[PDB]
């Protein structure tokens, strides 16, 4: 009763010299409090890196899930951006058992790090080759957590590690349009997000919602990157039909949608679409390896838009 209370205080104070003393004399590092927390949970949550290292050296199991979420010590490190503590645990013999461990509700460490915008910790996990798009129990990937807390830098890092920009059939473009985040919309387009995917509940496309919110800048960016003007949702409306459920004309969004839903677009862009579809919207650096002129390829990448 004294020893567990004393080793705890040594950790909370950062008295690591004591912690190593008690471990040498047989004190096991693997008991649990009433929340299932181990000394590695406590040490990680409180940022005590030196305590963390020596606990590992004496057999402390970092795979243990707490009784209040099924969270591991590495989850709580992910929460507070404790990269160094995490790097110790990932260098241990348990790396592959902890790196993608899921909480009760399906959140991995990468889910937690992306949600809190912990850049370093995100690079950490990708450095040790964490899966980039594990699925939560609701189907949610880490990028989506990053997206909805608007952790732009973690968004840029995950997309750079090939996170699926088209998760749940274009939800990132959906998010940009719903929020009118035009920076996000442009960035996801320049990175090759497919504009012709309908959400599986109501079949709406990004162009559809760029009309529900009469956002002409979104509508235009989507069309300019090749959103299809006659795709129809689950209730049969084209994107222009959506703007007609509000009708009343006199607004640049339906004025633009009218001008593009009737006149079929150029053959120069229709060939851009098929070439980019043939080459693959997430493999568009293969265009630098093509036999064309800079101007032609510039047009292909939508560079000067």
């Amino acid at each position: 009763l004294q020893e567990e209370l004393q080793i705890q205080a040594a950790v909370a104070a950062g008295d690591v010299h004591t912690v190593r003393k008690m471990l040498e004399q047989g004190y096991s590092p693997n008991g649990r409090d009433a929340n299932g927390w181990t000394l590695l949970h406590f040490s990680a949550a409180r940022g005590k890196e030196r305590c963390v290292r020596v606990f590992l050296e004496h057999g402390a199991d970092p795979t243990v899930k707490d009784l209040i979420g099924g969270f591991t010590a590495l989850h709580y490190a992910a929460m507070h951006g404790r990269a160094r503590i995490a790097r110790l645990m990932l260098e241990s013999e348990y790396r592959s058992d902890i790196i993608n461990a899921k909480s009760n509700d399906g959140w991995t460490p990468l889910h937690v790090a992306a949600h809190y915008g912990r850049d370093s910790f995100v690079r950490l996990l990708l450095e040790f080759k964490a899966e980039v798009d594990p699925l939560s129990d609701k189907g949610t990937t880490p990028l989506q957590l990053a997206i909805i807390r608007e952790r732009s830098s973690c968004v840029k890092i995950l997309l750079d590690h090939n996170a699926n920009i088209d998760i749940q059939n274009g939800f990132l473009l959906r998010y940009a349009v719903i929020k009118s985040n035009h920076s996000y919309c442009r960035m996801f387009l320049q990175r090759g997000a497919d504009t012709n995917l309908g959400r599986l509940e109501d079949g709406q496309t990004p162009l559809h919602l760029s009309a529900l919110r009469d956002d002409v800048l979104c509508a235009r960016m989507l069309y300019n990157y090749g959103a299809d003007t006659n795709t129809r949702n689950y209730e049969g409306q084209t994107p222009l039909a959506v703007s007609i459920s509000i009708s009343g004309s006199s607004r640049p969004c339906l004025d633009f949608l009218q001008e593009v839903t009737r006149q079929p677009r150029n053959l120069q862009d229709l060939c851009r679409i098929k070439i980019r579809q043939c080459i693959g919207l997430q493999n568009l650096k293969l265009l630098d390896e093509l036999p064309i002129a800079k101007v032609m390829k510039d047009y292909l990448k939508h560079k000067f838009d």
């Binding site: 209040i68 909480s103 939560s136 949610t140």
Partner: peptide, 23 residues
């Protein structure tokens, strides 16, 4: 969109549960 609402419910739950140890 109700799409966002559930996602935000999920991130609510993530925050609640991570922070529960001191609640």
């Amino acid at each position: 969109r109700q799409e966002l609402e559930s996602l935000m419910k999920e991130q609510d739950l993530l925050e609640t549960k991570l922070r529960s140890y001191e609640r």
